[PDB]
């Protein structure tokens, strides 16, 4: 399925079983954004490692935000 | 209106400001960066392209203002 | 009472009165990560340093995890 992230916005190529970390990476692959720099929020929670795209429900289309940790917070 | 930010300061600010917009104004009184501040109302952590009215931030509302590097 | 910590898990003897700011000092004391690296996480929710535990509802066996802030949310 396909996901959104907005920072400007890119499309990933995921699976509900996807893990956040594995979210990262992907972003990084595609952005060059090292991953220990990236807060997702997806319906104004911020993602944590260990959890998948299903526990927070993140389903097609859906749209996450990211902020850089840098600074912005 | 009036709005207070504890870490105790008052900032005169609109329902339409910017969260970042509010840490500019907390920086022209406070010193504090911009980049260094969490800002926290009603127990969540404020963001930067939302306005005070999207958390109903009204007259008299306090909010709480972390360092960042002082982790939490 | 005890409460658990995870990452590795550690346990910690703390009284609900304790501060947020103490436990995390109880942490370094027992695994040497600094309390300015540390983000506590309880039922969802990453703990700020002005309540104590019971604030939080937590209790004998709550499980709380660490992230360090290393990350990356």
């Known amino acids: ?17 996807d ?3 594995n979210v990262k990476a992907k972003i990084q692959d595609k952005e060059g954004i090292p991953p220990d720099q990236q ?7 911020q993602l944590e490692d260990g959890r998948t795209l299903s526990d927070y429900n ?4 859906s ?6 940790r ?4």
């Not at 807060?39 to 929670?45: N, S």
């Not at 749209?63 to 850089?68: A, C, E, G, Q, R």
């Open 1 to 17: 399925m396909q996901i959104f992230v907005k920072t400007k916005t890119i499309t990933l190529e995921v699976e509900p079983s």
């Open 19 to 21: 893990t956040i970390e």
């Open 39 to 45: 807060r997702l929020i997806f319906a104004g929670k």
């Open 58 to 61: 993140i389903q097609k289309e």
């Open 63 to 68: 749209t996450l935000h990211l902020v850089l």
């Open 70 to 73: 840098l600074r912005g917070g």
